[PDB]
């Protein structure tokens, strides 16, 4: 029998190649790497997500959840061809404890809508990311950085408890006292490896006080140096009130972002040290907010733009290829900045974004050892993308980025963060310590490699 007709029992809607639903279906942030899968499910019950983990057993396909399909490397469409993709748009399951302090969030959620639902619920939010179309579901389940990170946590540290399909179908719970190692394993590695997650529950967060965003920016190549010092030795003692992150692109911008927890009125100390060593007459732009305004001025909207867009922001793609680093305290040696300017600027088309962690973090502040998130000691990571627009530029876009990533490397650490999923990155990189016990659980839970990608968690553990 065929997966047409194994699917059709569920009921589940569908799409199969050939077709338009298929073929709109497709579309994912990264258009590099246009995977054509067997099939697009989109279950809206926990029965029709066991069914297609039963047909894609059957027929002997692969298959790949996919939340918002943001994945650097298309592995929501499979990291191959031929997988049986599980879009889970359909799971928007939402509730909100104010007791407890939790909240109830289904695996389909963007993060823009996902603001909204927890503001006007009670005010609350969870630290996540920026971009409006992300999902909540590879975002949380690889880390998550966003600008209140530094006050309330990443949204992987958020998570209370999830619900997936496992490989043999059973619908698992996994929090701190069900299943433990399920739940280490998906805080910070829980991309596909280990099933399909179908619900999270968010510890929730207050921001009902207004909070301060700040930017300042410069167009002038001979001030990099000077602006990234300058961020470097100010961002060593920013305290936990403050997420931050510096930008840097070959054309000469650069600047630095930030969200502060508190009144407008108190920002300028905290400021003070960075604007006094960076060069002059920045663009200057500080606002006082509300906490859904932020959300909308993060991704440059007016502050006075209609909350409800968060619900409507538009999907937009690119070509690109992006790798990342961890920088350690107190950051790259002088001589390591010069390098990485002079690196950056033997090309063109890319941008480089450095979110702040450091130790007065809560980031930094868990014990480690506790989550499959490892990236506890840093100062900043490193984002590094190069786009094209026609391949031809691909292969020396490519080089370009890997290049830089190789002087970047001399300066800095080994690790990566895997929400910036990168192929050529070897998995000790992202898992480390944690890998060996990532591996065991793997064994466990899925000893047939039902869910696998060129970077999913692998059955044979290192000699
Ligand atoms: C496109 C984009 C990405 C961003 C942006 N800004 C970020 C930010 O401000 N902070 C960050 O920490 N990261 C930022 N990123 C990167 C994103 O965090 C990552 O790209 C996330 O992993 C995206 O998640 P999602 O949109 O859900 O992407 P998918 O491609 O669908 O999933 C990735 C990965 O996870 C697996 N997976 C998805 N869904 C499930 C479920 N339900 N259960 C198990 N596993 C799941 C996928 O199979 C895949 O392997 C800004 C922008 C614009
Ligand atoms: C799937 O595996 C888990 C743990 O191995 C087990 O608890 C569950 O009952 C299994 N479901 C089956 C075999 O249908």
Redesign the pocket.
């Given at each position: 029998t065929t997966l047409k007709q194994c699917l059709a029992k569920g009921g589940a809607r569908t799409a199969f190649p050939g077709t338009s639903e298929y073929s709109t279906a497709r579309l994912?942030?990264?258009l590099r790497e246009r995977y054509a899968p067997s099939a697009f499910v989109f279950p809206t019950t926990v029965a029709q997500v066991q069914n297609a983990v039963f047909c894609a057993k059957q027929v002997g396909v692969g298959i790949?959840?996919?939340?918002?399909?943001?994945?650097?490397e298309?592995?929501?469409?499979g990291?191959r061809d031929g997988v049986l993709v599980?879009d889970?748009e359909g799971?928007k399951q939402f509730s909100y404890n104010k007791a407890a302090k939790t909240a109830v969030v289904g695996?389909?959620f963007?993060l823009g809508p996902l603001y909204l639902a927890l503001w006007n619920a009670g005010k609350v939010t969870i630290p996540?990311?920026?971009?409006p179309?992300?999902?909540?579901?590879?975002?949380?389940?690889?880390?998550?950085?966003?600008f209140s990170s530094r006050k309330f946590g990443?949204?992987t540290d958020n998570i209370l408890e999830v619900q997936?399909v496992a490989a043999n179908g059973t619908v698992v719970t996994a929090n701190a006292q069900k299943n433990k190692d399920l739940y280490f394993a998906?805080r910070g590695a829980?991309?596909?490896?280990?099933?399909?997650?179908?619900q999270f529950t968010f510890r929730v967060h207050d921001v009902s006080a207004p909070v301060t965003h700040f930017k300042y920016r410069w167009n002038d190549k001979a001030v990099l140096f000077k602006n990234f010092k300058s961020f470097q030795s100010w961002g060593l003692n920013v305290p936990a009130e403050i997420s931050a992150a510096f930008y840097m692109d070959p054309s000469g911008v650069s600047w630095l972002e930030g969200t502060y927890l508190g009144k407008k009125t108190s920002l300028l100390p905290l400021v003070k040290t960075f604007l006094a060593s960076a060069a002059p007459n920045p663009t200057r732009v500080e606002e006082e907010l509300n906490w859904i305004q932020l959300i909308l001025v993060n991704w440059n909207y007016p502050s006075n733009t209609n909350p409800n867009q968060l619900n409507n922001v538009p999907f937009?793609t690119?070509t690109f290829k992006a790798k990342s680093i961890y920088v350690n305290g107190p950051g790259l040696s002088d001589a390591g900045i010069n390098a990485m300017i002079n690196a950056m600027n033997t090309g063109s088309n890319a941008y480089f974004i450095y979110?702040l962690y450091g130790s007065q973090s809560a980031i930094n502040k868990v014990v480690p050892g506790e989550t499959a998130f490892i990236h506890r000691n840093s100062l900043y990571s490193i984002?590094m993308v190069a786009s094209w627009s026609n391949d031809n530029n691909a292969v020396t876009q490519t080089s370009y980025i890997t290049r830089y990533w190789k002087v970047v490397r001399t300066y800095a650490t080994g690790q990566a963060?895997?929400?910036?999923?990168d192929r050529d990155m070897p998995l000790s990189a992202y898992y480390g310590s944690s890998l060996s016990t990532l591996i065991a659980g793997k064994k466990k839970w899925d000893p047939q490699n039902v869910?696998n990608?060129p970077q999913?968690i692998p059955l044979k553990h290192h000699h």
């Open positions: 994912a942030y990264n790949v959840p996919r939340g918002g399909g943001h994945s650097y298309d592995y929501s469409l990291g599980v889970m799971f695996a389909g963007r996540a990311g920026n971009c179309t992300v999902g909540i579901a590879g975002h949380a389940l690889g880390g998550g950085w966003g990443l949204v997936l998906i829980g991309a596909t490896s280990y099933g399909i997650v179908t937009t690119n979110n984002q963060y895997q929400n910036y999923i869910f990608f999913s």
